[PDB]
Design an enzyme around this catalytic site. Structure first.
Site, mmCIF file in Angstrom:
data_model
loop_
_atom_site.group_PDB
_atom_site.id
_atom_site.type_symbol
_atom_site.label_atom_id
_atom_site.label_comp_id
_atom_site.label_asym_id
_atom_site.label_seq_id
_atom_site.Cartn_x
_atom_site.Cartn_y
_atom_site.Cartn_z
ATOM 1 N N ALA A 33 0.653 -1.334 -0.067
ATOM 2 C CA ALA A 33 -0.008 -0.055 0.099
ATOM 3 C C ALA A 33 0.959 1.142 -0.067
ATOM 4 O O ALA A 33 1.682 1.632 0.927
ATOM 5 C CB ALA A 33 -0.832 -0.160 1.204
ATOM 6 N N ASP A 34 0.856 1.997 -1.111
ATOM 7 C CA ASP A 34 1.716 3.198 -1.261
ATOM 8 C C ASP A 34 0.826 4.387 -0.569
ATOM 9 O O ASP A 34 0.009 4.326 -0.101
ATOM 10 C CB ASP A 34 1.860 3.367 -2.550
ATOM 11 C CG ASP A 34 0.621 3.631 -3.483
ATOM 12 O OD1 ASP A 34 -0.310 3.974 -2.932
ATOM 13 O OD2 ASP A 34 0.775 3.614 -4.694
ATOM 14 N N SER A 35 1.492 5.498 -0.785
ATOM 15 C CA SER A 35 1.102 6.663 -0.101
ATOM 16 C C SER A 35 -0.688 7.013 -0.071
ATOM 17 O O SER A 35 -1.257 6.975 0.948
ATOM 18 C CB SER A 35 1.745 7.984 -0.789
ATOM 19 O OG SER A 35 1.054 9.235 -0.474
ATOM 20 N N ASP A 37 -2.910 4.741 -1.349
ATOM 21 C CA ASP A 37 -3.180 3.543 -0.902
ATOM 22 C C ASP A 37 -3.461 3.618 0.759
ATOM 23 O O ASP A 37 -4.560 2.980 1.430
ATOM 24 C CB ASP A 37 -2.329 2.300 -1.152
ATOM 25 C CG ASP A 37 -2.785 1.947 -2.965
ATOM 26 O OD1 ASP A 37 -3.532 2.528 -3.407
ATOM 27 O OD2 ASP A 37 -1.803 1.444 -3.234
ATOM 28 N N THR A 38 -2.378 3.786 1.392
ATOM 29 C CA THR A 38 -2.361 4.095 2.946
ATOM 30 C C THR A 38 -3.427 4.840 3.165
ATOM 31 O O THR A 38 -4.042 4.776 4.236
ATOM 32 C CB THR A 38 -1.028 4.397 3.563
ATOM 33 O OG1 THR A 38 -0.619 5.494 2.661
ATOM 34 C CG2 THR A 38 -0.031 3.480 2.875
#
Ligand SMILES: *P(=O)(O)OCC(C)(C)[C@@H](O)C(=O)NCCC(=O)NCCS
Lengths: 72, 99, 50, 49
Positions: A33-35, A37-38
């Site tokens: 989970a990227d930015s 996504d987080t």
């Protein structure tokens, strides 16, 4: 229950399998989970329990264990 | 004065909750959308990041023009034609990925 | 050989360009709109907290 | 058509215009009318077309 609702939310917000998401499964590495996504994951977690989290308290959470801990 | 302002605050709270729910559902759907294109479609063909800086209107318009051409292009292959025709439904987007 | 290759090249060029245009457009609009909605939600969240 | 939102109307118009571009390669006159009308702010143009 809460400890499985967390996994459900994390999975369908990241697409990761229920098995991959252990309590220690770190979102950025284990779940990828990227930015954004987080951010979306914390957003959906807030929705699931219709509760809000402080900005620094929310961003502090980065692991399934920490997520459940704050949630419960 | 403060109570008057807190009225607007509560209105904005409601608005923010609505937006939050909407974005949650959007991300949930996009997960499966991605996991369709995740099969080697994303890299250079289906994702085209240079297009990130335009709006839904232009993208939809050009998509419709492209389809108006492609349908004649896909006049041959009945099942490929069926994929195109069905995915023509904008409400069910990932069809177009499968197509 | 030239005829065969020219015909097939032209056909594949046409179909690929059209299909990519068509499908990547809808994909990218979905992506941009999701990003914009996230941005709006973040703005709302920050303003609400303040 | 009053019972549909603008987005659907725009989509339908563009989808029609696409096939129109494919077809009109035959006649110069219709092609010219199209090449003038396709812009949004000139509805009358499309009508002439
Ligand atoms: P990702 O690399 O796209 O990063 C997204 C983000 C972490 C920058 C974003 O989710 C975010 O946190 N934006 C708002 C930051 C903030 O606290 N703003 C103050 C209130 S407007």
């Amino acid at each position: 229950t809460i400890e499985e609702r967390v996994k459900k939310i994390i999975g369908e917000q990241l697409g990761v399998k229920q098995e991959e998401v252990t309590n220690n499964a770190s979102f950025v590495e284990d779940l990828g989970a990227d930015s954004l996504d987080t951010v979306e994951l914390v957003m959906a977690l807030e929705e699931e329990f219709d509760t809000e989290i402080p900005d620094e308290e929310a961003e502090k959470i980065t692991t399934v264990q920490a997520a459940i801990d704050y949630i419960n | 004065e403060m109570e008057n302002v807190q009225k607007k605050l509560r209105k904005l709270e409601r608005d923010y909750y609505q937006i939050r729910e909407q974005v949650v559902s959007a991300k949930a759907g996009w997960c499966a959308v991605m996991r369709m294109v995740k099969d080697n479609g994303v890299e250079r063909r289906l994702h085209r990041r240079e297009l990130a800086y335009m709006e839904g209107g232009a993208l939809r318009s050009m998509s419709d023009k492209a389809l108006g051409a492609l349908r004649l292009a896909v006049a041959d292959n009945e099942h490929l034609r069926d994929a195109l025709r069905l995915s023509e439904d904008p409400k069910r987007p990932e069809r177009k990925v499968q197509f | 050989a030239i005829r065969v290759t020219q015909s097939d090249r032209d056909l594949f060029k046409h179909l690929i360009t059209e299909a990519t245009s068509y499908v990547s457009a809808d994909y990218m609009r979905h992506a941009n709109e999701r990003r914009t909605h996230l941005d709006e939600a973040l703005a709302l969240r920050g303003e609400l907290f303040g």
